[PDB]
């Protein structure tokens, strides 16, 4: 159930100064490589400890392809200006997502190739890897252009070929690393509010990956009734945090339990307010 994606962005800025091009690679949703045109000496850079293995040749090759991509976005960016009737001196964004997913068997399960402009779907390659799904009128020009040139075939080759060969490779190099986990460490905090009623908040900190489940219960019953839940957030050190809470009637506090479910725990966690 692995995958590899390259998220590319090109943003034009006021003036005749070429746009900034940023390209980021992922394996199983983890950033492993990165390139930025703004940097001092622009080169592709390692972003996961297991990528330092690749010798000079690899980084050189990747750096070139990226310089080509940057030019490709420069050109494409001008054409869009026309498609939409935009003056040559504004702020624009062109994005691309490409990659492949491997199934249980490690065979290509699906390939991806999409673009967005100004934050919206523009044109995407279909699962068949031969037909396109343009999002609007403007995008039709491009779709017609790409059909009338077999542009789809070009991507198909990459998606079923190199994409798969290199994902297998990266998976081999960063095997155990990628498949790691850090269990969350939980604790409950008490906070006042309403006359009588009070708030109990269950915290989950230091866990990886970000997937986690926080539940509150009253007398063994899933209290999915009015529970505060923040979006999971990065702590900064590479781990995550998330918390859920509920408003409870004072005194009847120790009548509630928090349960934490995470892929890294030997067994789920249960904890209650501890004055």
């Amino acid at each position: 159930p692995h995958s590899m994606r390259y998220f590319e962005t090109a943003v034009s800025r006021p003036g005749l100064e070429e746009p900034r091009y940023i390209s980021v690679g992922y394996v199983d949703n983890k950033e492993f490589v990165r390139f930025d045109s703004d940097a001092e000496n622009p080169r592709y850079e390692p972003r996961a400890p297991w990528m330092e293995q690749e010798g000079p040749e690899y980084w050189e090759r990747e750096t070139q392809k990226a310089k080509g991509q940057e030019q490709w976005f420069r050109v494409s960016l001008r054409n869009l200006l026309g498609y939409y009737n935009q003056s040559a001196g504004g702020s624009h964004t062109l994005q691309q997502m490409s990659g492949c997913d491997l199934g249980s068997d490690w065979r290509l399960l699906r390939g991806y190739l999409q673009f967005a402009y100004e934050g919206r779907d523009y044109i995407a390659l279909n699962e068949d890897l031969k037909t396109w799904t343009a999002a609007d009128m403007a995008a039709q020009i491009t779709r017609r252009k790409w059909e009338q040139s077999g542009a789809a075939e070009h991507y198909k080759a990459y998606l079923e070929g190199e994409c798969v060969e290199w994902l297998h490779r990266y998976l081999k190099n960063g095997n155990a690393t990628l498949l790691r986990t850090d269990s969350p460490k939980a604790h409950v905090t008490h906070h006042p509010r309403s006359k009588g009623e009070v708030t109990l908040r269950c915290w989950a900190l230091g866990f990886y990956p970000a997937d986690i489940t926080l539940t509150w219960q009253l007398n063994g019953e899933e209290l999915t009734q009015d529970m505060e839940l923040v979006e999971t957030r990065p702590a900064g050190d590479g781990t995550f945090q998330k918390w859920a809470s509920v408003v409870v009637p004072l005194g009847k506090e120790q009548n509630y339990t928090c349960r934490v479910y995470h892929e890294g725990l030997p067994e789920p966690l249960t904890l209650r307010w501890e004055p």
Binding site: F35, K65, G68, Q69, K145, A151, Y155, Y158, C163, W166
Partner: peptide
């Protein structure tokens, strides 16, 4: 492995 785009949009 950075993919290299085909025809421009």
């Amino acid at each position: 492995f950075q993919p290299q785009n085909g025809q421009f949009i």
